[PDB]
Structure 1
Amino acid sequence: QLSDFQRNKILRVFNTFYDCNHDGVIEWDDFELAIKKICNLHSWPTDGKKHNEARATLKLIWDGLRKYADENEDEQVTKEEWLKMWAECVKSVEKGESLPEWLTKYMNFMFDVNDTSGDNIIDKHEYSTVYMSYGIPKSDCDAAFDTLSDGGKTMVTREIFARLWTEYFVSNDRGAKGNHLFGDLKL
């Protein structure tokens, strides 16, 4: 099974990042709210291009996640269904396999949502602008970002972000840089 460390990293992403309306389950409703929060954050127009593409990509993510995790087909994913699914993805990745396509889509969507300047690099102000809207404090965004970029030695490109992403969800190493991808963790 998942270690405490892995389980707790996985539950945080559930509670802090996927369950937008904080009712304790993930549903299409949570994706609709995520889109409005991003529109408000970055001032995107409703039914404009950015808005429409985000909606189309989020449907595909929700569809993948529902197919993977929604055991009882009630169109809602509970924390139990999430962890049940995650325990398999982690073993799966450990046996040389990919992470699910919906999860890779969500990783690329988030990189895009961070990199507002479109230069293929997340900078520290862009990183804190997104993560703060999820309730991550400024000091924990800056500490995470110092770790993720090696104190500015490493440019946090799409590919670097991708590798750090996989590390967050699957690593049981308390030293892995990707542990901090969603805000500084005290370990």
Structure 2
Amino acid sequence: QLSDFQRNKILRVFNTFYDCNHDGVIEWDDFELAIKKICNLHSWPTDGKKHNEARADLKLIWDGLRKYADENEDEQVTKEEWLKMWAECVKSVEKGESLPEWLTKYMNFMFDVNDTSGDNIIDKHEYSTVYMSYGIPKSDCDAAFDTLSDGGKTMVTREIFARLWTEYFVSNDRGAKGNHLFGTLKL
């Protein structure tokens, strides 16, 4: 079973990042909102390259998510279904397996949404630009970024971002850096 700490990390991500219209379930309509929000944030032209690519990528991610979590096949993922899926995913990451492919795709999507300069590094300004748009206070973006980059000793490359992303979802260690990947947690 997920510890309180894991369960709460996994709920907080459902609630802030996936359920964009905040009604308590994840559907395709949420991903339609997530596309609008990222288009607004970055000033992408509707039906331009980035927009059409974001839509295609998120379709694949939603499809893999529903496949894993949508037990009653109603095209909606409730918190119950999301927690049931996560308890099984975490067990498996511990037994040695990679996270599900919809989750890695979503990690790579969010990496590139952050890295608007395209140099393979998320810098402090890129990071706070994205997380502040989800309601993360700026001081929790800046404190998170220093934690994640080990105060500048580590560049937040796609690979670092991917390893921190797995740690956020599975770690039971309160000390883990990836706990703060989505804004500092007070622990």
Interval containing the TM-score (normalised by the shorter chain):
over 0.9
For residues 64-103 of structure 1, the C-alpha deviation after alignment (integer angstroms, 9 at most, x for no partner) is: 0000000111100000000000000000111101100000
- SS in structure 1 of the partner of residue 25 of structure 2: coil
The equivalences for 1:9-158 within 5 A come to 9-158=9-158
- The answer for unaligned runs of 5 or more in structure 1 is none
CA distance in 1 between counterparts of 2:164 and 2:98 reads: 15
Which 4+ stretches in 1 moved above 6 angstroms?
A: none
Could you state the TM-score of these two structures normalised by the residue count of structure 2? 0.99
Could you state the TM-score of these two structures normalised by the residue count of structure 1? 0.99
In percent, how many aligned pairs have the same letter?
99
CA distance in 2 between counterparts of 1:162 and 1:70 reads: 25
For residues 10-61 of structure 1, the C-alpha deviation after alignment (integer angstroms, 9 at most, x for no partner) is: 0000001100011110000000100000000000011000000000000000
CA distance in 2 between counterparts of 1:54 and 1:89 reads: 25
For residues 102-147 of structure 1, the C-alpha deviation after alignment (integer angstroms, 9 at most, x for no partner) is: 0000000000000000010000010000000000000000000010
CA distance in 1 between counterparts of 2:185 and 2:98 reads: 26
- The answer for unaligned runs of 5 or more in structure 2 is none
Deviation at 1:153, TM superposition (A): 1.0
CA distance in 2 between counterparts of 1:116 and 1:141 reads: 17
CA distance in 1 between counterparts of 2:83 and 2:48 reads: 35
Aligned pairs, how many?
187
- SS in structure 1 of the partner of residue 183 of structure 2: coil
